[PDB]
Design an enzyme around this catalytic site. Structure first.
Site, PDB file in Angstrom:
ATOM      1  N   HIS A  40       0.825  -1.050   0.086  1.00 47.53           N
ATOM      2  CA  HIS A  40       0.085   0.058   0.017  1.00 47.53           C
ATOM      3  C   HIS A  40       0.792   1.124   0.104  1.00 47.53           C
ATOM      4  O   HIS A  40       0.289   2.366  -0.342  1.00 47.53           O
ATOM      5  CB  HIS A  40      -1.075  -0.048   1.065  1.00 47.53           C
ATOM      6  CG  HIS A  40      -0.602   0.406   2.430  1.00 47.53           C
ATOM      7  ND1 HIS A  40      -0.236  -0.438   3.437  1.00 47.53           N
ATOM      8  CD2 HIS A  40      -0.483   1.543   3.174  1.00 47.53           C
ATOM      9  CE1 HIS A  40       0.013   0.158   4.474  1.00 47.53           C
ATOM     10  NE2 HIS A  40       0.010   1.552   4.190  1.00 47.53           N
ATOM     11  N   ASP A  84       0.019  -7.618   1.909  1.00 49.69           N
ATOM     12  CA  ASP A  84       0.358  -6.089   1.742  1.00 49.69           C
ATOM     13  C   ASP A  84       2.007  -6.278   2.135  1.00 49.69           C
ATOM     14  O   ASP A  84       2.518  -5.962   2.952  1.00 49.69           O
ATOM     15  CB  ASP A  84      -0.017  -5.234   2.909  1.00 49.69           C
ATOM     16  CG  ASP A  84       0.004  -3.794   2.917  1.00 49.69           C
ATOM     17  OD1 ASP A  84       0.517  -3.519   1.833  1.00 49.69           O
ATOM     18  OD2 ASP A  84      -0.157  -3.190   3.922  1.00 49.69           O
ATOM     19  N   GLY A 175       2.096   6.950   8.492  1.00 50.34           N
ATOM     20  CA  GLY A 175       3.423   7.473   8.196  1.00 50.34           C
ATOM     21  C   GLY A 175       4.690   6.348   8.608  1.00 50.34           C
ATOM     22  O   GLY A 175       5.826   6.296   8.209  1.00 50.34           O
ATOM     23  N   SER A 177       3.487   3.226   8.180  1.00 50.91           N
ATOM     24  CA  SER A 177       3.459   2.072   7.267  1.00 50.91           C
ATOM     25  C   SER A 177       4.761   1.498   6.462  1.00 50.91           C
ATOM     26  O   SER A 177       5.531   2.472   5.866  1.00 50.91           O
ATOM     27  CB  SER A 177       2.492   2.746   6.188  1.00 50.91           C
ATOM     28  OG  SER A 177       1.142   2.708   6.733  1.00 50.91           O
ATOM     29  N   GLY A 178       4.860   0.286   6.048  1.00 47.40           N
ATOM     30  CA  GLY A 178       5.930  -0.192   5.543  1.00 47.40           C
ATOM     31  C   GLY A 178       7.095  -0.473   6.318  1.00 47.40           C
ATOM     32  O   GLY A 178       8.118  -1.332   5.802  1.00 47.40           O
TER      33      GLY A 178
END
Ligand code: CA
Length: 223
Positions: A40, A84, A175, A177-178
């Protein structure tokens, strides 16, 4: 990260920032040429920033390297956030040192109750908006699958796990994320989603990296 602590410069040497004119997502360096992040977080024109602490000041340890290709998991579903995960190849190899270092992939899935380290530059408030310039860290346990499925009925797949605190107050956030979830020195999770941040009965949901190791290894060996 809500309710965490300042990691300290280059104490999370595998943490990267994805930059598209601004920081937008985190990621993890798994070898000198590859980063793992969340699908995402995909966009074209990513620059990977390594060796960062303060994302707004050049401190002298950074390496800024453009991505040459991005590979989103072939079964990624943007509606459910199942699978994801994304790989990013760097145009040139990073120089690995004490400030920039790779994190190992897991041979084995992590256990409920295992304390993990989550990190990133995301929002530090559960209500309102305050972005830090320096890297924040949180220790959080992996939750049992049954408490996870109870928190998010009908939404948790076998490729997800929950980590955090059902009382709320401590969580990853927008923020982050990942970014990495590291347990027992291995990358076990990727910051994926959750309902708000740090809300009671709504822990963070993470991509379960141990399910992807075969795909990652095969992809890196051919690209
Ligand atoms: Ca910096």
């Amino acid at each position: 990260i809500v309710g965490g602590y300042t990691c300290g410069a280059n104490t999370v040497p595998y943490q990267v920032s994805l930059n598209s004119g601004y920081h937008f997502c985190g990621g993890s360096l798994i070898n000198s040429q590859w980063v793992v992040s969340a699908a995402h977080c995909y966009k074209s024109g990513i620059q990977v920033r390594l060796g960062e602490d303060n994302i707004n000041v050049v401190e002298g340890n950074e390496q800024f390297i453009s991505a040459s290709k991005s590979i989103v998991h072939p079964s990624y579903n943007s509606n459910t956030l199942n699978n994801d995960i994304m790989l990013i190849k760097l145009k040139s190899a990073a120089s690995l040192n004490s400030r920039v270092a790779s994190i190992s992939l897991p041979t084995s899935c992590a256990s409920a109750g295992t304390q993990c380290l989550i990190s990133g530059w995301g929002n530090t408030k559960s209500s309102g908006t305050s972005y830090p310039d320096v890297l924040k860290c949180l220790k959080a346990p992996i939750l049992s699958d049954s408490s996870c499925k109870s928190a998010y009925p009908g939404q948790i797949t076998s490729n997800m796990f929950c980590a955090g605190y059902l009382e709320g107050g401590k969580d990853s956030c927008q923020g982050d994320s990942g970014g990495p979830v590291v347990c027992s020195g291995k990358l076990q999770g990727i910051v994926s989603w959750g309902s708000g941040c740090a809300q009671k009965n709504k822990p963070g949901v993470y991509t379960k990296v141990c399910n992807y190791v075969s795909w990652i290894k095969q992809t890196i060996a051919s690209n």
